[PDB]
Design a protein around this ligand. Structure first.
Ligand code: ATP
Ligand code: ATP
Ligand code: 9E0
Ligand code: 9E0
Ligand code: MG
Ligand code: MG
Lengths: 330, 334
């Protein structure tokens, strides 16, 4: 069985874009792959977090994984900072990553624009720690949304570069990007993707949004000024309507069967809202159960970090041995 | 309760008289009045490409030379950086509180980028952050380094202050200790660049294990100026090679530059070179008598690293625990 690894930041409440781009695939892959899923709190602090909100968001993210169907008896689930090997491989991989590879990254430039007062070395080094997360587990396949394609390309290049110097230390990982829902767009600015960290909460549908909020947010989503108004797919010219179709389509898997609903944008918006909320209520029932069982959350983190540590330590010893470090005395 | 001292050196070649005068001599001398922790920073070393077999050998070479110089494992904690995972862990955390601009302004990154233009890697750029992690983990008060690391230590002070301003008094704010002489010993054939263990041209450096004959030859060929008559006077701008010899002699003997200039009135650079070579070789006799016994005692080397890593881990994990609590991480279940 190939190995699957993927992560999400506790930087906010997971969104429907997180669900369609990543989490839905994570759940689907649990029988055909040895799946390892991580709450990457070390990545989350590359953007300034209130300390209380970060601890809460870590546990919220864990309960949301569980609520979406990530099964701790099938998959390893763990918190990144609980496994020191991630930071240790992160440093070693820095020494095999070109500065130019990092400065050219779309996320670094975009987040630097968004956080001009906190352009820190963690933001720059983000893809290297990502590569470390992935390569530690001899990962074959990495289910992510479209925005992480470039980062995953670096992970592939780093694995191959290190292997060329030292032998077959790493597996070379490949992305798994879904054909629908890989880049869900912001409701009030459909030219930019939906991001859980957005200060403007109305761009985003969180997985825990009650039915009234969903109606309100979807009703106000930016749509085009065509005359007459019809539901057609043109990302360059009907970005908002196209994103609303993508959301409903990747929620019900039909495509042009909805394109054949030839009504007004308010009919689409009422349907998206009802459909989206029907999904959440099932998820939300499991969440409110998992989130308030602290003993269960602690057991899942404990068991998951122990499982991850066994694999991560094996790869890291091999890396340290290859590089030339004196082994830690036992 | 003694103030805490931390310092490191990379396993990147035989330590030089520059490493000794700028750092190692002070390391030894601070062992009685400070709680001293000294590190072989192999994770920093790999920011420049190393052959794996040479790195492993150089790690033990460096450890044995620490011990031969008088670093005392009864008095000091001695360990290899990679043996203590908290260093990389805090290294990542401090990345998130270090500005990209601060790192791009470091002179070392610029200078090494020029030397290794084919390997300008993210480790070389992030070098000072891991350095700050190494130091801040141990609640360090004083960091004995040569002058070239002054800028890097200023960053460590800035990172500690920045972090404490957000989270409370998690870190001690470390201070450099840089000697008044021998803080930047210069290369013998190119006196405008410092002595460096990593220099491909071995005739630029005096390693701590070099014979008296080898010392005499390298000092003899050291670049000087064309003053006729020769003038033994300290002037880095105009007389870099002669000034470096005076600095080296001053660093060995304790004699001031004015005293040495008076001493060498009417004398030739050959007089200066002979006195430098004799002084340097006398400085090295004791550590050279002991090096091979330390280097060939593998059980001793392993035991020192074992005990040191255990002692380091106890202090580092307490600081890292406090850092992770302050940042907002969920603590690992026990
Ligand atoms: N709008 C989106 N559509 C689809 N997938 C997405 C979207 N945003 C993020 N993802 C995916 O979700 C996963 C987790 O990413 P991440 O934790 O960074 O979420 P995020 O919403 O981008 O948060 P942040 O704004 O803090 O970066 C990744 O696989 C990422 O590609
Ligand atoms: N020429 C020098 N004079 C005085 N101190 C020096 C000199 N070179 C290095 N040092 C000091 O020696 C210590 C260890 O530095 P390090 O291990 O990098 O040595 P190095 O000779 O600079 O090697 P490399 O060329 O690999 O950087 C530091 O405190 C550094 O400031
Ligand atoms: C959450 C982030 C992350 C850290 N480690 C990994 C490993 C795999 C995929 C991802 C990540 S996806 C990435 C992102 O920023 O989207
Ligand atoms: C060896 C390097 C290093 C790593 N961690 C530390 C901590 C203190 C002093 C130094 C270092 S000195 C520095 C240098 O490059 O000179
Ligand atoms: Mg993101
Ligand atoms: Mg150096």
């Amino acid at each position: 069985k190939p190995i699957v690894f993927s992560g999400a930041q506790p930087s906010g409440e997971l969104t429907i874009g997180n669900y369609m781009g990543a989490l839905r695939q994570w759940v689907n892959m649990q029988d055909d792959y040895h799946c390892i899923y991580c709450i990457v709190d070390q990545h989350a602090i590359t953007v300034r977090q209130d300390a209380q909100k970060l601890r809460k968001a870590t546990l919220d993210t864990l309960a949301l994984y569980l609520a979406c169907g990530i099964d701790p008896e099938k998959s390893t689930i763990f918190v990144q900072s609980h496994v020191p090997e991630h930071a240790q491989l992160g440093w070693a991989l820095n020494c095999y990553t070109y500065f130019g590879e990092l400065s050219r990254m779309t996320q670094f430039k975009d987040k630097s624009a968004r956080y001009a007062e906190n352009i820190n070395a963690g933001l720059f080094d983000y893809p290297v720690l990502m590569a470390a997360d992935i390569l530690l587990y001899q990962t074959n396949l990495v289910p992510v949304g479209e925005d992480q394609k470039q980062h995953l390309e670096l992970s592939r290049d780093i694995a191959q570069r290190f292997n060329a110097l030292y032998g077959e230390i790493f597996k070379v990982p490949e992305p798994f990007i879904p054909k629908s829902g890989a880049r869900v767009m912001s409701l009030l600015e459909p030219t930019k993707k939906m991001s859980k960290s957005d200060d403007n909460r109305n761009n985003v549908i969180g997985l825990l949004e009650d039915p009234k909020s969903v109606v309100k947010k979807i009703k106000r989503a930016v749509t085009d000024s065509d005359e007459p108004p019809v539901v057609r797919y043109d990302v360059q010219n009907k970005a908002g309507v196209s994103n609303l179709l993508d959301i409903l389509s990747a929620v019900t898997g039909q495509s042009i069967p909805e394109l054949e609903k030839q009504k007004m944008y308010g009919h689409l918006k009422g349907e998206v809202a009802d459909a989206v909320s029907g999904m959440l209520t099932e998820l939300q029932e499991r969440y409110h159960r998992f989130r308030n069982d602290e003993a269960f959350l602690q057991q899942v983190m404990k068991d998951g970090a122990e499982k991850a540590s066994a694999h991560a330590s094996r790869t890291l010893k091999a890396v340290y041995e290859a590089i030339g470090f004196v082994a830690k005395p036992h």
